Amino acid sequence: VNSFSGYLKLTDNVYIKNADIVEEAKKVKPTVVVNAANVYLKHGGGVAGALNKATNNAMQVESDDYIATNGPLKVGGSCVLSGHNLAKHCLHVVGPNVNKGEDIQLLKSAYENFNQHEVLLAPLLSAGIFGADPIHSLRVCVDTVRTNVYLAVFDKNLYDKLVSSFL
Numbered sequence: 264v265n266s267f268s269g270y271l272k273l274t275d276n277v278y279i280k281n282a283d284i285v286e287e288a289k290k291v292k293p294t295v296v297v298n299a300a301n302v303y304l305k306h307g308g309g310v311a312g313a314l315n316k317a318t319n320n321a322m323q324v325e326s327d328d329y330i331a332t333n334g335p336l337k338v339g340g341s342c343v344l345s346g347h348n349l350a351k352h353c354l355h356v357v358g359p360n361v362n363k364g365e366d367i368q369l370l371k372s373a374y375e376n377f378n379q380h381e382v383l384l385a386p387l388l389s390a391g392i393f394g395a396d397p398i399h400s401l402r403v404c405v406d407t408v409r410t411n412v413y414l415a416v417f418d419k420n421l422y423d424k425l426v427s428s429f430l
């Protein structure tokens with residue numbers, strides 16, 4: 264048993280809810296919250312801007328130190344950093360940004376990072392301002408992630424479309 268409430272069960276391991284991932288993290292304080300990161304860990308907008316704002320910019324300060332030491336992530340890659348006031352850990356995952364021309368085949372590699380963690384609270388990778396089709400992102404998630412993933416979908420309209428079109 265875990266603390267996640269109000270989710271619709273899609274598969275053995277994938278759950279979904281219409282929720283603000285920031286508000287959900289603040290309420291649950293999960294072991295792992297996933298950030299929709301870019302390779303520079305520049306948390307300007309979308310999910311990353313919202314998570315970082317909720318940390319009072321502490322996520323960005325930690326991220327800048329990480330990049331100064333390690334250099335940029337790979338598209339499809341990840342790193343584990345603090346979850347600050349939102350979670351124990353933040354798994355920063357870089358899905359391909361379609362609005363920058365990145366190979367959508369890298370979305371499966373991105374979701375494979377989730378398999379290193381038993382339970383996660385996550386957004387749909389490469390959705391929103393990353394430009395991918397969220398229906399596709401949910402299918403790759405279901406077909407790739409084997410650990411228990413709780414998906415927060417901000418937009419109620421999109422949530423309902425994802426549920427009603429799910430195979």
Ligand SMILES: O=C(O)c1cnn(-c2ccccc2)c1
Nearest residue numbers: 390391397415416417418421
């Ligand atoms: O609410 C969300 O989490 C979400 C993810 N993707 N999108 C979205 C919004 C507009 C156009 C494409 C995707 C919304």
